[PDB]
Design a protein around this ligand. Structure first.
Ligand SMILES: [Cl-]
Ligand SMILES: [Cl-]
Ligand SMILES: [Cl-]
Length: 163
């Protein structure tokens, strides 16, 4: 575990993280995809061997000894708000189980379902609150990765608010 488990946010490519493992915002078919998933494919292509997994689940594949946790958030284009919210919560619960099983002291994590799976809606608060619900009981240092300057400020404020 980390000595004083923390949350932090950084505005940079998650493929350049400084943590002991990475969460990929994956598609269910294990395809290279785009956004986070394509950066993750370029950096850790060996981790896409048998990475296909259903919506609401996470599947870990090693790249060398570096764990890539493929977490499949719902595409809100296809899911109802209600079912999508349930599957987004579930994907983060499965990430917490994997992070725990792996025994890592730190994890790099993107906000699931906030990009091309957002169904055109701002889901910063929805996705971050599900991330907190899952990860609060883990003792890994969590480093959240984003690309937008205004998102960085809002994520930082939400972390600081809980103290
Ligand atoms: Cl960068
Ligand atoms: Cl997404
Ligand atoms: Cl972002």
């Amino acid at each position: 575990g980390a000595m004083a488990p923390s949350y932090r946010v950084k505005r940079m490519d998650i493929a350049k993280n400084d943590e002991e493992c990475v969460v990929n915002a994956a598609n269910p078919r294990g395809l290279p995809g785009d956004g986070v998933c394509k950066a993750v494919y370029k950096k850790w292509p060996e981790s896409f061997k048998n990475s296909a997994t259903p919506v609401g689940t996470a599947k870990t594949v090693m790249c060398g000894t570096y764990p890539v946790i493929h977490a499949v958030g719902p595409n809100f284009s296809n899911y109802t708000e209600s079912e999508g919210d349930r599957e987004l919560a579930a994907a983060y619960r499965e990430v917490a189980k994997e992070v725990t099983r792996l025994g890592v002291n730190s994890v790099a994590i993107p906000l699931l379902s906030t990009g091309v799976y957002s169904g055109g809606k701002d889901r910063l608060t929805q996705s971050l609150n599900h991330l907190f619900t899952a990860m609060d009981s883990t003792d890994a240092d969590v480093v959240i990765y984003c690309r937008d300057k205004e998102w960085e400020k809002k994520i930082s404020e939400a972390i600081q608010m809980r103290t």
